[PDB]
Design a protein around this ligand. Structure first.
Ligand SMILES: CCCCCCCC/C=C\CCCCCCCC(=O)O[C@H](COC(=O)CCCCCCCCCCCCCCC)COP(=O)(O)OCCN
Ligand SMILES: CC(=O)[C@H]1CC[C@H]2[C@@H]3CC=C4C[C@@H](OS(=O)(=O)O)CC[C@]4(C)[C@H]3CC[C@]12C
Ligand SMILES: Cc1cc(NC(=O)[C@H](c2ccccc2)N2CCCc3ccccc32)no1
Length: 817
């Protein structure tokens, strides 16, 4: 601790380097310390520990160490027992007065503990006089009695009398100036507010305090001024600040967000740095302190969302309009987007508590959180923020299904003008939130879509196979379970079976072609295969062409994300090259045949991407994909172990040898029978036997290690494959549904046909969503309040208070008797 108003204050502050509080003289004391610590106002108290300071110090030792409030301790120098030591922290009266005046000057609280003349002089001098009432007897007690009474002279004489009467009259002259204290933080806040004495100034002081509960009492009053313009600035400051209860009070105070929302205000909010990766991300997507506008924010939003996405504000027309009402029809959407952008979670939760199309916003937030984490505390927010948003969306879906299955199904799928017309399912898939898709309602909708118009659900595979095999007879009956045949064909399941059968036929023809013979000119089967590939290429080019979003230049970039499509293109190119080489005479025909012979391997393996649909078949594919990398890593160990012994054995043998580029085969031969025979002057025979035995042991060791590795990996994969399988169904269904009805070799005519061809419900849905969210909040609150842990705490607190009251009442009963 460190030990002429201006000069004295400067000297005291220099050594210590530290409104106002001053004490002149358990729960209340603790509350006062908490208020002082929160405000940070230095407490002016006597420097002598004994007396009132002892009571002050008892509470100070309670929680001072547990901000280090710069309490001011002033005591006479002569009182110091040791002069050398004399020469609380930063350790006369006029100095305090002028220090208070200086503090008040910049854009003054006194507490009495057990004096009256000093209080009166301070009240007269300083414009404010908010003296804190003192329960202890003395001059403060007399002042409090005089203030309450506003008879008195006789009592004062019974308890000098003339001086007391004069002091009481002087206090009455400044009646209501002295702070009234009655059995603490709220009372202190009210006293400080009264001492400060414009409505915007009071609102700013309350916001600075941040005590929403205390601030409400001061702000809440009738016949207030509320000058125009102050409310907007206060709301802007509150939104910039992390305070939430203040914003809620503004909303309940009559402040309209729709009226508040404006382009300039939002731009200033976005470009502000007064708060807790937006800048770096914007710079990368897009210039220090560069003026950020809605256009750039929308552009970075679209960047983060992914390809084939759009934003209502993130569009060229919006940018042109901004460059050239000016009120967002749905301010909550933009506010929530910003709140999640700047990593403000509680405000995002509150905004989501009140909004239209909450489920869509929640899924977008989960997508944004994951994307931000991947692009980039980052691990912490990714695990919590994105997961929490997804869980909220799942809970909302579950509640809606309970309230109404049909309405939940309808809500799941409907165009959103705000979000570039993307349904909830598409957003969930983009976010890869398997939980949302795994829900019963989503699976039911996917099954209904997959079955198409036909309602059959028993022996579906056999029925589809029969319908494909026997159209004219099957279709008429299958329609119940003309137009019936057409709607049967248009169903995705029959398209899937049609494509599967066509692919099987193509495979059989390919096997028959390459496997037998070759001639100068290709046979009919090779022509059929070439037609297959040509039609498939036409289909791929058409699919890319219909992938219009992003224009022609930016359509291929998104379309290229899928690996299987790129592999298909590569295989098509290699097949075409091989076919071209085939018709180049015998010397080139023989060399080119092998290329498209090897090309068959890709087509046989492409069925794996289609074998993930089945419930019992996808786990095998997933396990293979997982174990590929494990085998890759195992190969290194296998080589390191085996090659050493192989090289040693080879070197021991063939002492005289020439390289001839033919040692790799010798080392890598690794024969079992030959080594075993080699196993069974003296040392030259012993050493090779030892080498052979070591190799033989190592082989089986590695084999068993591989077996164990595969078993463990398969178990780990199977623990999750069942849950994972459901996700791919939506992709498959939405893929086959869009595709035309004819097989790949026959869609050539399909393209010809294509060329030849060329609000109350919304209000009800909004009301249902509002009711669902309100019910969710009510249920959450009721369940939490009914928890045993909370009830036990409540009972314990009530018991303590009830017991204390009973004990006090016991003394009264004894006195009465
Ligand atoms: C059985 C005979 C041959 C088949 C086994 C193949 C060789 C593997 C054994 C060699 C080996 O890795 O053990 C290493 C020692 O190698 C030898 O001494 C032999 C382990 O070294 P460490 O410093 O003691 O501890 C490190 C823990 N990894
Ligand atoms: C681990 C091994 O044992 C391998 C790894 C690198 C291999 C070497 C690569 C370079 C050549 C050049 C060649 O000369 S030449 O006239 O035949 O071209 C002879 C063969 C030789 C010496 C190979 C011998 C086997 C290796 C040492
Ligand atoms: C089983 C199975 C295989 C399969 N193969 C196709 O459907 C189709 C195709 C057609 C002829 C030869 C090779 C492949 N192919 C691959 C995947 C889906 C698709 C989408 C647009 C254009 C082509 C295409 N479907 O189920």
């Amino acid at each position: 601790a460190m030990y002429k108003p201006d000069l004295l204050l400067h000297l005291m502050t220099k050594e210590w380097q530290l409104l106002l509080i001053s004490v002149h003289g358990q729960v209340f004391g603790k509350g006062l310390i908490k208020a002082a610590m929160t405000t940070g106002a230095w407490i002016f108290t006597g420097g002598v520990n004994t007396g009132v300071i002892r009571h002050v110090g008892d509470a100070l030792k309670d929680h001072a160490s547990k901000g280090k409030i710069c309490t001011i301790g002033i005591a006479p120098w002569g009182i110091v027992e040791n002069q050398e030591d004399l020469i609380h922290s930063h350790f006369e009266v006029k100095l305090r007065r002028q220090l208070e005046k200086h503090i008040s000057l910049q854009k003054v609280v006194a507490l009495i503990v057990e004096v009256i003349s000093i209080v009166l002089e301070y009240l007269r001098d300083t414009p404010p006089v908010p003296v804190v009432v003192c329960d202890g007897s003395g001059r403060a007690s007399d002042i409090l009695a005089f203030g309450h009474k506003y008879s008195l002279r006789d009592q004062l004489l019974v308890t000098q009398a003339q001086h007391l009467f004069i002091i009481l009259m002087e206090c009455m002259k400044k009646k209501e100036l002295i702070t009234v204290f009655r059995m603490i933080d709220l009372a202190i806040l009210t006293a400080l507010l009264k001492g400060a004495n414009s409505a915007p100034d009071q609102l700013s002081l309350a916001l600075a305090w941040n005590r929403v509960d205390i601030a409400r009492s001061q702000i809440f009053i009738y016949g207030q001024q509320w000058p125009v313009g102050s409310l907007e600035q206060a709301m802007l400051d509150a939104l910039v600040l992390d305070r939430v209860d203040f914003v809620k009070l503004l909303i309940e105070n009559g402040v309209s967000m729709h009226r508040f929302l404006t382009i300039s205000r939002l731009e200033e909010l976005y470009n502000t740095r007064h708060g807790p990766t937006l800048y770096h991300l914007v710079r990368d997507v897009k210039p220090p302190d560069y003026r950020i506008s809605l256009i750039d924010i929308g552009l970075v939003i679209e960047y983060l969302m992914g390809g084939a996405y759009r934003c209502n504000y993130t569009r060229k027309r919006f940018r042109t309009l901004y460059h050239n009402i000016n009120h967002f029809p749905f301010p909550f959407h933009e506010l929530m987007v910003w709140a999640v952008l700047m990593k403000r979670q509680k405000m995002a939760l509150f905004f989501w508590q009140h909004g239209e199309e909450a489920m869509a916003k929640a899924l977008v937030a989960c997508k944004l959180c994951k994307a931000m984490a991947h692009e980039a505390d980052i691990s912490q927010e990714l695990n919590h923020n994105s997961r929490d948003f997804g869980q909220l969306a799942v809970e909302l879906l579950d509640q809606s299904y309970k309230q109404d299955e049909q309405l939940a199904m309808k809500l799941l799928t409907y165009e959103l003008k705000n979000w570039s017309n993307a349904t909830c399912l598409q957003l969930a898939v983009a976010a890869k939130h398997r939980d949302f898709i795994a829900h019963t309602c989503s699976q039911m909708l996917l099954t209904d879509m997959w079955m198409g118009r036909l309602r059959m659900r028993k022996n579906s595979g056999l029925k589809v196979i029969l319908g494909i095999l026997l159209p004219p007879s099957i279709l008429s009956l299958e329609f119940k379970n003309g137009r019936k045949i057409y709607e049967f064909y248009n169903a995705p399941i029959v398209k899937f079976w049609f494509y599967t059968l066509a692919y099987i036929g193509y495979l059989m023809l390919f096997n028959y072609i390459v496997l037998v013979k070759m001639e100068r000119w290709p046979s009919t089967q090779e022509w059929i295969v070439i037609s297959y590939i040509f039609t498939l290429g036409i289909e791929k080019m058409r699919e890319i062409l219909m992938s219009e979003p992003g224009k022609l230049l930016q359509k291929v970039k998104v379309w290229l994300q899928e690996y299987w499509n790129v592999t298909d293109l590569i295989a098509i190119l290699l097949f075409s090259v091989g076919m071209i080489l085939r018709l180049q005479d015998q010397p080139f025909r023989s060399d080119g045949r092998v290329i498209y012979c090897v090309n068959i391997i890709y087509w046989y393996i492409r069925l794996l991407d289609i074998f993930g649909v089945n419930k019992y078949l996808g786990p095998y594919v997933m396990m293979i994909g997982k174990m590929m990398i494990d085998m890759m890593y195992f190969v290194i160990i296998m080589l390191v172990v085996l090659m050493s012994f192989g090289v040693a054995r080879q070197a021991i043998l063939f002492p005289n040898e020439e390289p001839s580029w033919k040692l790799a085969k010798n080392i890598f031969y690794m024969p079992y029978w030959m080594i075993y025979g080699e196993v069974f002057k003296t040392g030259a025979w012993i050493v090779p036997a030892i080498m052979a035995c070591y190799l033989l042991v190592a082989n089986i060791l590695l084999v068993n290690l591989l077996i164990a590795v595969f078993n463990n990996t398969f178990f780990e994969v199977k623990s999750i494959s069942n849950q994972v399988w459901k996700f791919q169904r939506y992709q498959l269904i939405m893929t086959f549904h869009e595709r035309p009805v004819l097989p790949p070799p026959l869609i050539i005519f399909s393209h010809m046909t294509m060329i030849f061809q060329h609000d109350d419900e919304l209000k009800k849905v909004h009301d249902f969503e509002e009711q669902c969210i309100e019910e969710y909040f009510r249920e959450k609150d009721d369940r939490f309040n009914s928890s045993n842990d909370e009830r036990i705490r409540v009972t314990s607190e009530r018991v303590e208070n009830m017991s204390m009251r009973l004990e006090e009442v016991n003394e009264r009963e004894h006195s009465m008797k």
